[PDB]
Curated annotation (Swiss-Prot):
Domain of life per record: Eukaryota
Compartments where found: Membrane
PTM comment, free text: A cleavage occurs, separating the extracellular domain from the transmembrane segment. This process called 'ectodomain shedding' is thought to be involved in receptor desensitization, signal transduction and/or membrane localization.
Function: Can bidirectionally induce pre- and post-synaptic differentiation of neurons by mediating interaction with IL1RAP and IL1RAPL1 trans-synaptically. Involved in pre-synaptic differentiation through interaction with SLITRK2.
Organism, as annotated: Homo sapiens
Family note: Belongs to the protein-tyrosine phosphatase family. Receptor class 2A subfamily.
Protein name (database record): Receptor-type tyrosine-protein phosphatase delta
Domain Fibronectin type-III: 21-115
Subunit and partners: Interacts with PPFIA1, PPFIA2 and PPFIA3. Interacts (via extracellular domain) with SLITRK4 (via LRR 1 and 2 repeats). Interacts with SLITRK2; induces presynaptic differentiation. Interacts (via the second immunoglobilin domain) with IL1RAPL1 (via the first immunoglobilin domain); induces pre- and postsynaptic differentiation of neurons and synapse formation. Interacts (via the third immunoglobilin domain) with IL1RAP (via the first immunoglobilin domain); induces pre- and postsynaptic differentiation of neurons.
Length: 121
């Protein structure tokens, strides 16, 4: 019972590409060669989200366009494995819609090491 669609020709009605980076982007190790990437939807979707794009590679020194990259279908969560322990790995996430693509998020770095729980000291 909310008011929003009174009649035709509204004050504003145009869905564009996502102009907001993904949040809650954090990578938590679960195994010796198995990670977990989870994030939340953007703040300014401006349209129905079709999915997302992830970027992870042992050699981040190269362009993200050359990175291994991953696939996503509106899951807000992806588990990557078959990696190497004791090795720094880069991870990135972004949002894209039928209109276009959106800006990436703050580049993060997670090391492949076993261990869970709250950090001490």
């Amino acid at each position: 019972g909310s008011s929003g669609s009174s009649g035709p020709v509204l004050t504003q009605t145009s869905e564009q590409a996502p102009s907001s980076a993904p949040r809650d982007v954090q990578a938590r190790m679960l195994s010796s060669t198995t990670i977990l990437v989870q994030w939340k939807e953007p703040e300014e979707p401006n349209g129905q989200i079709q999915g997302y794009r992830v970027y992870y590679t042992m050699d981040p020194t190269q362009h993200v366009n050359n990175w291994m990259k991953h696939n996503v279908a509106d899951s807000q969560i992806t588990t990557i494995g078959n990696l190497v322990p004791q090795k720094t790995y880069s991870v990135k996430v972004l949002a894209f819609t039928s209109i276009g693509d959106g800006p990436l998020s703050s580049d993060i770095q997670v090391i492949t090491q076993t261990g869970s729980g709250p950090s001490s000291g």
